[PDB]
Amino acid sequence: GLFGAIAGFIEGGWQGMVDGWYGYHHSNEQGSGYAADKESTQKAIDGVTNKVNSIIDKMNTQFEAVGREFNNLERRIENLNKKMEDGFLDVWTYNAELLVLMENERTLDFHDSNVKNLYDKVRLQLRDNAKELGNGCFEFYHKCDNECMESVRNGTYDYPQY
Amino acid sequence: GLFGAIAGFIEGGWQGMVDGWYGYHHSNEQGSGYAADKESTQKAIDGVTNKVNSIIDKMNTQFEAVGREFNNLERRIENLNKKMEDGFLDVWTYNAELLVLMENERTLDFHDSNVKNLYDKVRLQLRDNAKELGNGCFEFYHKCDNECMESVRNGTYDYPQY
Amino acid sequence: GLFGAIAGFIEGGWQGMVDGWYGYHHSNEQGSGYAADKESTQKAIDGVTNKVNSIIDKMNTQFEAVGREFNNLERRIENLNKKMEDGFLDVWTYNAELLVLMENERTLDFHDSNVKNLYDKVRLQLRDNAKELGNGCFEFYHKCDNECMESVRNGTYDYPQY
Amino acid sequence: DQICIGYHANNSTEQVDTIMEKNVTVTHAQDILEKTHNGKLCDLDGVKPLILRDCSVAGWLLGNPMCDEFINVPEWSYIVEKANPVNDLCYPGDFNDYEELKHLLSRINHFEKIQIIPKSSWSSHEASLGVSSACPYQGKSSFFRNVVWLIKKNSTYPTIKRSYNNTNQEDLLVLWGIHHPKDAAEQTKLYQNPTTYISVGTSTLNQRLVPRIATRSKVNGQSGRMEFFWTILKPNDAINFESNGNFIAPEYAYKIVKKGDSTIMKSELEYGNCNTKCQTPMGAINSSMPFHNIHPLTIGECPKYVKSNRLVLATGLRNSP
Amino acid sequence: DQICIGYHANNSTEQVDTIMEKNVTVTHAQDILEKTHNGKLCDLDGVKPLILRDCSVAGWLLGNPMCDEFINVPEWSYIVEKANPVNDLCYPGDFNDYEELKHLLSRINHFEKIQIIPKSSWSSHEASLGVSSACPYQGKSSFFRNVVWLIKKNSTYPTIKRSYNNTNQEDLLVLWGIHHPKDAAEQTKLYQNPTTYISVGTSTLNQRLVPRIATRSKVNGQSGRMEFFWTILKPNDAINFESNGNFIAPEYAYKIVKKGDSTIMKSELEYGNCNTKCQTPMGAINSSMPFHNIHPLTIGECPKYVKSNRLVLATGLRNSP
Amino acid sequence: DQICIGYHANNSTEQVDTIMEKNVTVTHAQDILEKTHNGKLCDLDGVKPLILRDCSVAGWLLGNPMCDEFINVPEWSYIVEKANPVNDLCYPGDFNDYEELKHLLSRINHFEKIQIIPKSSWSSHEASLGVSSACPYQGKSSFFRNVVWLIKKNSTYPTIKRSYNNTNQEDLLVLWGIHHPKDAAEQTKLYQNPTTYISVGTSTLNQRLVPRIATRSKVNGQSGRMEFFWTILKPNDAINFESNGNFIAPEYAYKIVKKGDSTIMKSELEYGNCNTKCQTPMGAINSSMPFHNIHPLTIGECPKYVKSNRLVLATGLRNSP
Ligand SMILES: *[C@@H]1O[C@H](CO)[C@@H](O[C@H]2O[C@H](CO)[C@@H](O[C@H]3O[C@H](CO[C@H]4O[C@H](CO)[C@@H](O)[C@H](O)[C@@H]4O)[C@@H](O)[C@H](O[C@@H]4O[C@H](CO)[C@@H](O)[C@H](O)[C@@H]4O)[C@@H]3O)[C@H](O)[C@H]2NC(C)=O)[C@H](O)[C@H]1NC(C)=O
Ligand SMILES: *[C@@H]1O[C@H](CO)[C@@H](O[C@H]2O[C@H](CO)[C@@H](O[C@H]3O[C@H](CO[C@H]4O[C@H](CO)[C@@H](O)[C@H](O)[C@@H]4O)[C@@H](O)[C@H](O[C@@H]4O[C@H](CO)[C@@H](O)[C@H](O)[C@@H]4O)[C@@H]3O)[C@H](O)[C@H]2NC(C)=O)[C@H](O)[C@H]1NC(C)=O
Ligand SMILES: *[C@@H]1O[C@H](CO)[C@@H](O[C@H]2O[C@H](CO)[C@@H](O[C@H]3O[C@H](CO[C@H]4O[C@H](CO)[C@@H](O)[C@H](O)[C@@H]4O)[C@@H](O)[C@H](O[C@@H]4O[C@H](CO)[C@@H](O)[C@H](O)[C@@H]4O)[C@@H]3O)[C@H](O)[C@H]2NC(C)=O)[C@H](O)[C@H]1NC(C)=O
Ligand SMILES: CC(=O)N[C@@H]1[C@@H](O)[C@H](O[C@@H]2O[C@H](CO)[C@H](O)[C@H](O[C@]3(C(=O)O)C[C@H](O)[C@@H](NC(C)=O)[C@H]([C@H](O)[C@H](O)CO)O3)[C@H]2O)[C@@H](CO)O[C@H]1O
Ligand SMILES: CC(=O)N[C@@H]1[C@@H](O)[C@H](O[C@@H]2O[C@H](CO)[C@H](O)[C@H](O[C@]3(C(=O)O)C[C@H](O)[C@@H](NC(C)=O)[C@H]([C@H](O)[C@H](O)CO)O3)[C@H]2O)[C@@H](CO)O[C@H]1O
Ligand SMILES: CC(=O)N[C@@H]1[C@@H](O)[C@H](O[C@@H]2O[C@H](CO)[C@H](O)[C@H](O[C@]3(C(=O)O)C[C@H](O)[C@@H](NC(C)=O)[C@H]([C@H](O)[C@H](O)CO)O3)[C@H]2O)[C@@H](CO)O[C@H]1O
Ligand SMILES: *[C@H]1O[C@H](CO)[C@@H](O[C@@H]2O[C@H](CO)[C@@H](O[C@@H]3O[C@H](CO)[C@@H](O)[C@H](O)[C@@H]3O)[C@H](O)[C@H]2NC(C)=O)[C@H](O)[C@H]1NC(C)=O
Ligand SMILES: *[C@H]1O[C@H](CO)[C@@H](O[C@@H]2O[C@H](CO)[C@@H](O[C@@H]3O[C@H](CO)[C@@H](O)[C@H](O)[C@@H]3O)[C@H](O)[C@H]2NC(C)=O)[C@H](O)[C@H]1NC(C)=O
Ligand SMILES: *[C@H]1O[C@H](CO)[C@@H](O[C@@H]2O[C@H](CO)[C@@H](O[C@@H]3O[C@H](CO)[C@@H](O)[C@H](O)[C@@H]3O)[C@H](O)[C@H]2NC(C)=O)[C@H](O)[C@H]1NC(C)=O
Ligand SMILES: *[C@@H]1O[C@H](CO)[C@@H](O[C@@H]2O[C@H](CO)[C@@H](O)[C@H](O)[C@H]2NC(C)=O)[C@H](O)[C@H]1NC(C)=O
Ligand SMILES: *[C@@H]1O[C@H](CO)[C@@H](O[C@@H]2O[C@H](CO)[C@@H](O)[C@H](O)[C@H]2NC(C)=O)[C@H](O)[C@H]1NC(C)=O
Ligand SMILES: *[C@@H]1O[C@H](CO)[C@@H](O)[C@H](O)[C@H]1NC(C)=O
Ligand SMILES: *[C@@H]1O[C@H](CO)[C@@H](O)[C@H](O)[C@H]1NC(C)=O
Ligand SMILES: *[C@@H]1O[C@H](CO)[C@@H](O)[C@H](O)[C@H]1NC(C)=O
Ligand SMILES: *[C@@H]1O[C@H](CO)[C@@H](O)[C@H](O)[C@H]1NC(C)=O
Ligand SMILES: *[C@@H]1O[C@H](CO)[C@@H](O)[C@H](O)[C@H]1NC(C)=O
Ligand SMILES: *[C@@H]1O[C@H](CO)[C@@H](O)[C@H](O)[C@H]1NC(C)=O
C-alpha cells in the first residue's frame, strides 16, 4: 500500500484482534494481549460508511429505459432509439465499474494510512524510551506493566517519568 | 487526513499566521512569532489554481439542449427527445458532482501532505540536536537565537556547528 | 509529490541506475556503485501494467456512431440524431481525458510512495547504527564492506552485530 | 516488554478489484449488485397486470372474437404482450398509427367500455351479416366485436349520417374502419354503390377515406383488407360519420377513466400468482441493492440497471494469508 | 527554545463535501455554480428578441388580423412564444408541417415581407369578400392578411393559372391554403364548381390538393376548415398555381435575408427593458461561473447547465475549531 | 561509508499532464491515441467496397444509363457515395422512402439482379419507346435500364394485369414508378386514357397511385416527373400490378442473397488499391492503440474514436533536470 504499513513494515494482520480494525498488542511479565484503538477504528467506520452511501446516492439519478415501438418503415428512428438506450447503459455501466475500482483502491489505502498514523502516534510518545524494532513493535528500556501499557494507549505516556 | 499532520499530530491551525498556508513558529529569549514558508505555500497555490482551471476546462465541452417541437401524433419521438435531453443532463450533473467530491478530498489531503513534508524537512535537518516533542515542535538542546532560527527556515541549519 | 521522496528529500534521480526504477548506491573503501531493488521495482511494473490494461479495458465498451440519412422535411429528427451522436462523443472524450489526468497523478505519486517505503525499510533496519544525512543517504558508524552493504539490501542487516 | 501496533485479520475469502490489482482478498466487503430474480410475472404492488396471452393490443381493442377473455378488463398496473401474438387482426389489414396508440396506453391504467352506436339502430342497413371465415368463433363466422361491418339492405346502401356527442367527463377512444374489396364485383355485391367514401369529423379531425381496390394475395383466406383508424374524442366534442359504403362503424368505444404509470412489457411468460415491488420482462426483483443486471426495462421502485457481472465495494482492509 | 511547524487557520465558515465526509469547514473555497438570474427577458447583445405576446408563429406568419403589431418586425436575436397563445389560427384548421417550419426559424434572424401576387390583380375573381367573423378586426369581419381568400365573381369561378418567379437573391418562404367547406351547398355557394382542386408546382414540389367535405363541430363559429401549406422557393425557381376553387392565394411572402443563430423560447414573461449576454426562459444570466442551474434551454455565451443545488471546490485547507 | 536510496533518471523528454501540473517530464510514457491514417479508401479484410463514383444509390438501383459500371456488382464490404453525386435521377422526380431504403442497405452485402417481367412480353403496349433526352446514352435518348416506361400502341392503352410470384428462397427488392405528365394533352398523347391509376398489391402492400398533373419548372429539360416506389417481396408472396396508364413497370429486380455488416460511407475519395482492417471516410487505420481521433464513422475492428488531440499515460516516474 501507499502508506507502507499494512503488508509492509507490519507483515500481517492479527486473527486475535476481534474488537476493532486497528489496535495494540502488549507483552510483559504479567501477560500479553490485544486491545483495539476505539477512536481510529470508529473514524474508519464513519469514513467508509459515508463513502458507501455517497456512492449509492450519486448513482441515484440515472438513465431509465422506456419501451417504444416502431413499424417496418421507421427503421431509422428505431435504430436511433436503440443506439440511444444502449449508449446511456454503457455510460452508466462505465461510471459504476470505474467508481468501484477507484474507490476500492482508496479504501484499502485509507486503512493503510490509519495504521501508519496510529503507529507514528505511539512512536512520537515513546521517543527514545523504547527501541523501534522495525516490525510494528517497540521494545521498552524500562519495565512496562499494564498501567504503563495503558498510558501508551491513552496518549498519556509520561516520557519524563521514564 | 491521510498524511497525519493536519488535525493529527499537529492538533490545530494558527490564526496568527496570516501571510501563508504553512510555516514556522519560533520561541526563544528574544521573543516569538510566525513566519510563512514561501516555497511550499506557493507550490500549493500553483497546484490548486491549476486544478480549478483543469476542472473548469474539462467541463467546457458539454451537452447543450435545443428546443424541438412535436405534434400530437409524434408522441414517441417527443418522448425520445425528452429522454435524450434529460439523460445527458443527468450524466453531466453526475460528472460535475463526483469530480468536485473526489477532488475536494484530494485537495484537503494535498495540504496535509505539504505540512507533513515541511515537518519532515525540518526534522531531517535538526536530527538529534533537538527533542521531537510530538506536537509539531522541536525543542533545542542548544540556545537558538533568531539567526539560528532563520537557518532552520533557510535549509542551512549547520548541524556540525551545534 | 505527496510522499516527499522523489524530487523532495531525494533531490534527483540517477542516470547511473539502469537496471531498475528504485535502488541503492553504496560507497566504501572498496569502491562504489548502483544496485536495483528487484522486488519493489517489479511491484511497480505489475501495478502500472495492470493499470494501463484496466484503463484500456474499461474504455472497451463505448459509443459507436452509425450513418443515418434524413430528407428535407425531417430536419427535427436529423438534428436530434446529430445532437445524440455528438453528445456521446463529448461524454466519452471527457471520460478518456479525465481518466488519463487522474491516473497520471496517481502513477507519479505511486512511484514516490515506493521510493519512500524503500527508504523507510532501510531506515528501520539501520536504526541508530548510522547517521541519517537527510538526502536519502545513511552514513555508517562502523566500516561497511560489500558483504555488509549486501545485507542492507537483503533485509538481513544484523544490527546486534554492529 | 513490548507494545506493537497492528491490524485486523480474519477468515474472509471475499475479493475486490482495484485499478492496479485484481482479486485482492479483504476482511469485509459489500456487494451492491442484485443478480437474482424469481422468474415470474407478478402483481405490481397488489395490482395485477393485463396479460394479453395470445392476443395483441389490436385484437384486444377491436374485440377479436378469440379475445373474449379481455372483453371487460379491470384496471392494470402494466400490460404484457408476446413478441408475436397469433390473435392480431383476424381479417387481414392495417391498424393506422398503431405504435402511437400503444404509446398512449403507457399512460393508461383503466378503460371502461361503453356503447355509442347500438348495433340494432341501423334500420336502413343490414348490420348482422358483417362476418367472415377469417374471424371464427365456436365454428361459425364472426367479426371484431367492437365494430359493425355494415352492408346493403334490399339492394340499396343509402348514405349514413351519424353523430355521437361525448357527454362523458372522460376522454374517449373511438375506433372505426374501412373495408377494401377484392374487385369491382365485390364492391357492388356488398355495397351497391360503385364509388364510395367515409368522412369523419371532430373539432380536430377532418378525414375522408376512399376504398383502394387492388388484386391482393390471400391472407387467412381473404383478398380484401380492413384498415382501422382511431381518435381521442375530447369531452363535449362530437364525432360525425358520413358514408356511402365500406364503413366499419363503431359499436363500442373505451372511456379513459384512469391515467397514470404503465408500460407494455414484451414477454413470453405467463402469470406467476405472485407479488412484487419491481417487475422485469424475465422476472420480479426483491432486494435492497442499489444496482441490478436483470433487464433494462423495469417498472416499479427498482435498483438501477447496469450491464456488470460484478460490483463489490471494499469496506474492510487487505486480508493476510 | 523551540521551533514549530504549523498551518493557517481563520474565521471561515465555508464548507465543502468530500466522499467520506460532508460539511468540512475550510479556510478558503470557490463556488462554481451560478444560482441567480434577473427574472426578465432581455436584449441579447443589444439585439432585441421578437416577443410574439399573445400571437403564435402561425398567427404571425399568416398575418392573423389580431397580430398587426408584428406586420413588419425588425431582425431578432431569439423568439419568445407563450405556451398557449390565444391568437393562433383564428379561422379553424391546420398548418401543415408546422413543427418543421418552426425548426427552420431557429436558423433565421430576419424576414423581409414582399408582395408576390397583388390583391387587386384578380380581375376574374372576387378578391375582397374573403372574410369571416372568426377573424375579427375593429368590430368587422377580416382574414389572415398575407393570403387572399378568393371566391366566384358573377356566379363563375374560372380556372386560375398564376406563376411567380423568384428573381430575388434570397430564399423565399411562400404560404398558401385550401378551404374545406361544411357541405355541397356551401361549395357551390362560394366557388360554383362542385369538384375542385389546387395544383402547386416548383422544381421540387408536385402538389395537388382536393377539398375534403365533412360535417364538423363548430370551432370559433365555423364548420369549415382552412389547411395551410408552405414551401421554400429557391432563387431563380418559379412557383406555379392552378386552381378550380377553394384556393387561398398568396398575397405576401417572406424573404429570408439573414440566417444564423436563433431559437424559439417558450415563456409567459414579457419584455424586460434590459440587456444580457446569456438568456433563459425565466431570466437572464450575468456571471463568470463555469456552471449554472437556472434552466437547460439558454442562448448566448453561457455557463454549462447542471441540475445541482451546490458546487463548491475546496481551495484552502481544513479549518480549526 | 554510506548507502543511499534513490531512483531512476534518463534522457527522456516525454511529457504527461496531471490535474495539478501540465507538461511533467517522465522517464517513460505510453501514447494510447492513434493520430495517423493512410488517406485512402481500401479493401476491408480483402473484400472490396462498392465505390459508386459519380452515381447515387438511386441511379445505381434504378439503372441510370450513366451507371452501367454498376450494372452487376459483386458483393461488397461497405459502400461509398459522394456528398452530391451528379448521376442521381436523370429524369427529375422523387424516390419514395429513399432514406429508409438506404438504411436497409446497411444490412446488405450482395444483390443478385434477376428479370421478373421481360421487356419483350408487353404485346399489348409499346415497350421500346419509353425514353427521354434527360437520360442520354452514347448520344441517344435512353432511360433507367431496370424499369420499362410503357406507352400506348396504335392509340390504345388497355388495362394491364400482371403478377409476379417470388419462387426464390431470398427476399426480393422490387422497384417501379409512376409518371406525372406536364398537362392534359401530354397524358392522352402518351396513354390515351385521361384518368388513370396504378394499383399494386402484395400480402402487406395495398397501394393505388394516381398521376398528379401540375405546371412545373423544367429540370433537365422536363416539366414531367417520375415518382419511384419500392417494396420487399417476401418468399412465396406475389406482387400484383394493375394499371390504366402512367405505369413504369419493373423489368429487373434484386435478390438479397447476403445480409450482414455494411455501411454507406460519405466520401469524395476514390479507390486506393489497398487493404485494411479498419476504414474511415478519410482513410484507413492500422494500429494497436485503444483510441483514435481520425473520424467517428468507421467500419471494421477499430479503436474507439475520441475528440482528443493527445492521450499519453505515465508509466515511469518524474524525470530529473
Ligand atoms: C355536445 O352536447 C353538449 C350538451 O349536451 C353541448 O354542450 C353545450 O350546449 C349548449 C350550446 O349552445 C350550451 O347551452 C348554453 O349553456 C351556457 C351556460 O353557461 C355555463 O353556465 C351554466 C350554469 O349552470 C353551466 O351549467 C354550463 O355548464 C356553462 O358552463 C349558456 O350560457 C349559453 O347560452 C347563452 O345565453 C346567452 C344569453 O342568455 C347568450 O348571450 C349566449 O350567446 C348563449 O346563447 C349556452 O347556449 C351548453 O351549456 C353546452 N354544454 C356544456 C358546456 O356542458 C355541446 O356543444 C355538444 N357538442 C357539439 C360539438 O355540438
Ligand atoms: C425565372 O426567371 C429568370 C429570369 O428572369 C430565368 O432565368 C434564366 O432565363 C434564361 C433561360 O433561358 C437565361 O437566358 C440566357 O442566359 C445565359 C447567360 O449565361 C450566363 O452568362 C451571363 C453573362 O452576362 C450572365 O448574365 C447569366 O447570369 C449567366 O450566368 C445564356 O448563356 C443562355 O443562352 C444560351 O445561348 C447559347 C448560344 O449563344 C445556347 O447554346 C444556349 O442553349 C442558350 O440558349 C440563356 O438562354 C437567363 O440567363 C437565366 N437567368 C439567370 C441565370 O439569372 C429563370 O429560368 C426563370 N425560372 C423558371 C423556372 O422559368
Ligand atoms: C406463389 O407460388 C407458389 C407455388 O409456385 C404458391 O405456393 C403454394 O401453392 C399451393 C397453394 O395451394 C401449395 O400446394 C399444396 O402444398 C401443400 C404441401 O404441404 C407441405 O408438404 C409438402 C411435402 O412435400 C412440401 O413440399 C410443401 O412445401 C409443404 O410444406 C399441401 O399440403 C396443400 O394441399 C392440401 O391438401 C389437403 C388434402 O390432401 C387439404 O386438406 C388442404 O386444404 C390442401 O389443399 C397445398 O395445396 C404449395 O405447397 C405452396 N407452395 C409452397 C409452400 O412452396 C404460393 O401460394 C404462391 N403465392 C401466392 C400469393 O399465390
Ligand atoms: C382460390 C379459390 O379457389 N377460390 C377463391 C374463393 O374461395 C374466394 O371466395 C371467398 O373465400 C373466402 C375463404 O377463402 C371466404 O369464404 C369468402 O366468403 C366470405 C367470408 O367468409 O369472408 C363470406 C362472408 O359472408 C362475406 N361477408 C360479407 C359481409 O360480405 C365475406 C366478404 O364478402 C369478403 O370477405 C369481402 O372481401 O366473404 C369468399 O368470398 C374468392 C374471393 O371472392 O376468390 C376465389 O378465387
Ligand atoms: C348553429 C346555428 O344556429 N346556425 C348555424 C349558422 O350560424 C351557420 O352560418 C354561419 O355562421 C357563422 C358564425 O357561426 C358565420 O356567420 C358564417 O358566415 C360567414 C362568416 O362570417 O364566416 C360569412 C362570410 O361572409 C362567409 N365568407 C365567405 C368568403 O364565404 C363565410 C364562409 O362562407 C364560411 O365560413 C365558409 O365555411 O361565412 C355563417 O355562414 C351555418 C353554417 O353555414 O350553420 C347553422 O347551423
Ligand atoms: C421551352 C421551350 O421552348 N419549349 C418546350 C419544349 O422543348 C418541350 O418539349 C419537350 O422538350 C424536352 C427537352 O427540353 C424533350 O425534347 C421532350 O421530348 C421527349 C423527351 O426527350 O423527353 C421525347 C420523348 O420521346 C418522349 N418520350 C415519351 C415516352 O413520351 C418524352 C415525354 O413525352 C415527356 O418527357 C413526358 O413529360 O419527351 C419534349 O416533349 C415542351 C414540353 O412538352 O414545352 C415547351 O415549352
Ligand atoms: C489512562 O491510564 C492511566 C494509567 O493507567 C490512568 O492513570 C491511572 O488511573 C487510575 C484509575 O483512574 C488510577 O487509579 C487510582 O488509584 C488510587 C490509588 O493509587 C486510588 O485512590 C484511586 O481511587 C484510583 O483507583 C491510577 O492512580 C492512575 N495511575 C497513573 C500512573 O496515572 C489515566 O487516568 C488514564 N487516562 C485516560 C485519559 O484514560
Ligand atoms: C539564511 O540565514 C543565515 C543565518 O541567518 C544566513 O547567514 C547569515 O547571513 C547574514 C546576512 O547575509 C550575515 O550577516 C553578515 O554579518 C557580517 C558581520 O558578522 C557582515 O560583515 C555582513 O555584511 C553581513 O551583514 C551573517 O554573517 C550570516 N550568519 C551566519 C551564522 O551564517 C544565510 O546567509 C541565509 N541563507 C539563505 C540561503 O538565505
Ligand atoms: C545476503 O547477504 C548476506 C551477506 O553478504 C549473506 O550472507 C553471506 O552469504 C554468503 C554466500 O552464501 C556466505 O559465503 C560463505 O562463505 C563461507 C566461508 O566463510 C563458505 O564456506 C561458504 O561456501 C559461502 O561461500 C557468507 O558467509 C555470508 N556472510 C554473512 C556475514 O552472513 C546472506 O546469505 C544473504 N541473504 C539473502 C537472503 O540473500
Ligand atoms: C480473479 O478471480 C476470478 C474469480 O474466480 C477469476 O475468474 C475466473 O477466470 C477463469 C479463467 O479465465 C475462468 O475460467 C472462470 O470462469 C472465472 N471464474 C469466475 C467465478 O468468474 C479470474 O480469472 C481472476 N482474475 C485475474 C486477473 O487473476
Ligand atoms: C450539512 O449542512 C447542510 C447545510 O446546512 C445541511 O442541510 C440542512 O439539512 C437540514 C436537515 O436535513 C434541512 O432542514 C435544511 O434545510 C438544510 N439546510 C440547507 C442550507 O441546505 C445538512 O443537513 C448537513 N449534512 C450532513 C450530512 O450533516
Ligand atoms: C470464520 O470465522 C467466523 C467467526 O466470525 C465463524 O463464524 C465461521 O464459522 C468461520 N468460517 C469457517 C469456514 O471456518
Ligand atoms: C424479499 O426477500 C426478503 C429476504 O431477504 C424477505 O425478507 C422479504 O419478505 C421478501 N419480500 C417479498 C415481497 O417477497
Ligand atoms: C474575519 O476576519 C477577517 C480578516 O480577514 C475580517 O475582515 C472579518 O471582519 C472577520 N469576520 C468576522 C465575522 O469577524
Ligand atoms: C454583471 O454584474 C457584475 C457585478 O458582479 C457587474 O460588474 C457587471 O457590470 C454586470 N453586467 C451587466 C451587463 O449587467
Ligand atoms: C538516450 O539514451 C539512450 C539509451 O537508452 C540512447 O540509446 C539514445 O541514443 C539517447 N538519446 C540521445 C538523444 O542522446
Ligand atoms: C501495419 O503497420 C505495421 C507497422 O507498425 C506493420 O507491422 C503491419 O504489417 C501493417 N499492416 C498492414 C496491413 O499494413
Residue F317 burial class via C-beta count within 10 angstroms: exposed 0-12, middle 13-18, buried 19 and up: buried
Please check whether residue C32 is in contact with residue C161, taking contact to mean a CB–CB distance below 8 angstroms: no
Please check whether residue F293 is in contact with residue F308, taking contact to mean a CB–CB distance below 8 angstroms: yes
Beta strands F33-34; E291-292: pairing state: unpaired
Query: What's the half-sphere exposure (Cβ side, CA atoms, 13 Å) at B118?
Result: 31
What does the alpha-carbon distance between residue A66 and residue D251 come to, in Å, rounded to a whole number? 33
The DSSP symbol for F218 reads -
Please check whether residue D156 is in contact with residue D186, taking contact to mean a CB–CB distance below 8 angstroms: no
Question: Cell 501507499 belongs to which residue?
Answer: A2
Return the closest-CA partner of residue D305 out of A96, A102, C85. A96
Q: Which one of A100, A137, A151, A154 makes the best mutation probe of the D interface by having the most chain D beta carbons within 10 Å? A: A100
Question: And the C-alpha cell for B138?
Answer: 522541536
Strand partners for E29 = E314
Q: What are the chain F neighbours of A73 within 8 Å (beta carbons)?
A: 97, 100
Beta strands D304-305; D172-180: pairing state: unpaired
Taking chain C, what is the end-to-end CA distance rounded to the nearest angstrom?
A: 35
Q: What is the 3-state secondary structure (H, E, C) of E89-117?
A: CCCCEEECCHHHHHHHHCCEEEEEEEECC
How many CB atoms sit inside 10 A of residue D194's CB? 10
Q: What are the chain B neighbours of F21 within 8 Å (beta carbons)?
A: 46-47, 50
Return the closest-CA partner of residue F174 out of F57, F259, F255. F255
Taking each helix axis as running N to C, give the angle between helix A75-126 and helix A38-58, from 0 to 180 degrees, rounded to the nearest 10. Answer: 170
Question: Cell 475520441 belongs to which residue?
Answer: F306
Please check whether residue A140 is in contact with residue D1, taking contact to mean a CB–CB distance below 8 angstroms: yes
By the CB < 8 Å criterion, does D21 face chain C? yes
What does the alpha-carbon distance between residue A114 and residue A124 come to, in Å, rounded to a whole number? 15
Strand partners for E225 = E180
Strand partners for F250 = F147
What does the alpha-carbon distance between residue A27 and residue A34 come to, in Å, rounded to a whole number? 9
Interface contact A83-C66, CB threshold 8 A: yes
The experimental technique behind this entry is X-ray
CA C66 → CA A77, E81, E321, distances in Å?
12, 35, 58
How many CB atoms sit inside 10 A of residue B34's CB? 18
Question: And the C-alpha cell for A12?
Answer: 500481517
What does the alpha-carbon distance between residue C21 and residue B115 come to, in Å, rounded to a whole number? 27
Question: And the C-alpha cell for C73?
Answer: 422535411
Q: Which CATH architecture has domain D1-47+270-321?
A: Ribbon (2.10)
Cα E254 to ligand 2 centroid, rounded to whole Å: 25
What does the alpha-carbon distance between residue F130 and residue F147 come to, in Å, rounded to a whole number? 10
Please check whether residue A59 is in contact with residue A75, taking contact to mean a CB–CB distance below 8 angstroms: no
What does the alpha-carbon distance between residue A66 and residue A74 come to, in Å, rounded to a whole number? 18
Return the closest-CA partner of residue F48 out of F23, F10, F79. F79
Q: Which one of E195, E216, E218, E222 makes the best mutation probe of the D interface by having the most chain D beta carbons within 10 Å? A: E216
Interface contact F215-E206, CB threshold 8 A: no
CA E261 → CA A95, E58, E254, F143, distances in Å?
34, 21, 18, 44
By the CB < 8 Å criterion, does A40 face chain D? no
Question: And the C-alpha cell for B145?
Answer: 537565537
Return the closest-CA partner of residue E244 out of E191, E175, E187. E191
Q: Give ∠ CA A32-A36-A39 in degrees, rounded to 5.
A: 145
Alpha helices for D63-214 (secondary structure H): 98-105, 184-191
Which of B30, B39, B156, B162 to mutate for ligand 8's pocket (most ligand atoms within 8 Å of CB)? B156
What does the alpha-carbon distance between residue B68 and residue E263 come to, in Å, rounded to a whole number? 10
What does the alpha-carbon distance between residue D163 and residue D183 come to, in Å, rounded to a whole number? 30
Distance from chain centroid for Cα D59: 10
Distance from chain centroid for Cα F1: 80
Q: In what order do the strands lie in the sheet with D50-51?
A: D50-51, D79-81, D264-266
Question: Cell 515537518 belongs to which residue?
Answer: B119
Question: Cell 442521381 belongs to which residue?
Answer: F88
Please check whether residue D153 is in contact with residue D130, taking contact to mean a CB–CB distance below 8 angstroms: no
Provide the phi-psi class of B118: left if phi over 0, else alpha when psi is between -120 and 50, else beta. Answer: alpha
| Every domain of chain C and the residues it spans | 1-162
Which of E91, E125, E132, E187 to mutate for ligand 5's pocket (most ligand atoms within 8 Å of CB)? E132
Entry field: residues in chain C: 162
Interface contact F200-D214, CB threshold 8 A: yes
Q: Residues lining ligand 1, CB < 6 A?
A: D 165, 167, 236-238; E 217
Residue A161: CB within 6 Å of ligand 7? no
Q: How many helices (H) and strands (E) does chain F have?
A: 3, 29
Please check whether residue B26 is in contact with residue B153, taking contact to mean a CB–CB distance below 8 angstroms: no
Please check whether residue F24 is in contact with residue B46, taking contact to mean a CB–CB distance below 8 angstroms: no
CA F237 → CA E13, E62, F161, distances in Å?
79, 49, 17
Question: Cell 398521376 belongs to which residue?
Answer: F211
Please check whether residue E24 is in contact with residue E318, taking contact to mean a CB–CB distance below 8 angstroms: yes
Question: And the C-alpha cell for A56?
Answer: 449509492
Q: Which one of B74, B76, B80, B90 makes the best mutation probe of the D interface by having the most chain D beta carbons within 10 Å? A: B76
Taking each helix axis as running N to C, give the angle between helix C75-126 and helix E98-105, from 0 to 180 degrees, rounded to the nearest 10. Answer: 60
Return the closest-CA partner of residue D249 out of D223, D229, D222. D229
Please check whether residue F251 is in contact with residue F147, taking contact to mean a CB–CB distance below 8 angstroms: yes
Question: Cell 423568439 belongs to which residue?
Answer: E79
What does the alpha-carbon distance between residue B134 and residue B138 come to, in Å, rounded to a whole number? 8
Question: And the C-alpha cell for D260?
Answer: 397514470
Give the closest-approach CA distance of E43 to chain F in angstroms: 35
Return the closest-CA partner of residue D259 out of D107, D46, D70. D107
What does the alpha-carbon distance between residue D30 and residue D21 come to, in Å, rounded to a whole number? 18
What does the alpha-carbon distance between residue F238 and residue F9 come to, in Å, rounded to a whole number? 78
What does the alpha-carbon distance between residue E129 and residue E119 come to, in Å, rounded to a whole number? 11
Please check whether residue E76 is in contact with residue E110, taking contact to mean a CB–CB distance below 8 angstroms: yes
Residue D140: CB within 6 Å of ligand 10? no
Q: What backbone torsions phi and psi does residue B68 show, to the nearest 5 degrees? A: -130, 130
What does the alpha-carbon distance between residue C122 and residue C118 come to, in Å, rounded to a whole number? 6
DSSP F144-208: -TTEEE-B-SSS--PPEEEEEE--SSS-EEEEEEEEE-SSHHHHHHHHS-SS--EEEE-SS-EEE
CA dihedral E111, E114, E119, E120 (to 10 degrees): 160
Strand partners for F2 = C27, C139
- Which helix (DSSP H) or strand (DSSP E) does residue E51 occupy? strand E50-51
Return the closest-CA partner of residue F173 out of F116, F245, F91. F116
What does the alpha-carbon distance between residue F261 and residue A21 come to, in Å, rounded to a whole number? 56
DSSP E264-316: EEE-S--EEEEEESEEETTEE-----SEE-S-S--EES-PEE---S--EEE-S
What does the alpha-carbon distance between residue F26 and residue A130 come to, in Å, rounded to a whole number? 42
What does the alpha-carbon distance between residue D61 and residue E264 come to, in Å, rounded to a whole number? 39
What does the alpha-carbon distance between residue F72 and residue F50 come to, in Å, rounded to a whole number? 11
What does the alpha-carbon distance between residue F18 and residue B55 come to, in Å, rounded to a whole number? 11
CA dihedral (F96, F99, F101, F102) positive or negative:
positive
Nearest CA in chain F to C143: F1
By the CB < 8 Å criterion, does B70 face chain E? yes
Question: Cell 538542546 belongs to which residue?
Answer: B141
Distance from chain centroid for Cα C147: 30
User: How much is the CA Rg of chain B, to the nearest whole Å?
Assistant: 26
The DSSP symbol for E96 reads T
Interface contact D214-F207, CB threshold 8 A: yes
Residue D13: CB within 6 Å of ligand 10? no
Please check whether residue A76 is in contact with residue B77, taking contact to mean a CB–CB distance below 8 angstroms: no
Strand partners for F79 = F50, F264
CA dihedral (B108, B112, B114, B115) positive or negative:
positive
Please check whether residue D311 is in contact with residue A100, taking contact to mean a CB–CB distance below 8 angstroms: yes
Question: And the C-alpha cell for B12?
Answer: 490545530
Return the closest-CA partner of residue E36 out of E290, E271, E272, E292. E292
**D77 by DSSP, 3-state: which?**
coil
How many CB atoms sit inside 10 A of residue F76's CB? 20
Q: What backbone torsions phi and psi does residue F54 show, to the nearest 5 degrees? A: -90, -5
By the CB < 8 Å criterion, does F202 face chain A? no
Residue F149: CB within 6 Å of ligand 6? yes
Q: What are the chain A neighbours of F103 within 8 Å (beta carbons)?
A: 75-76, 79
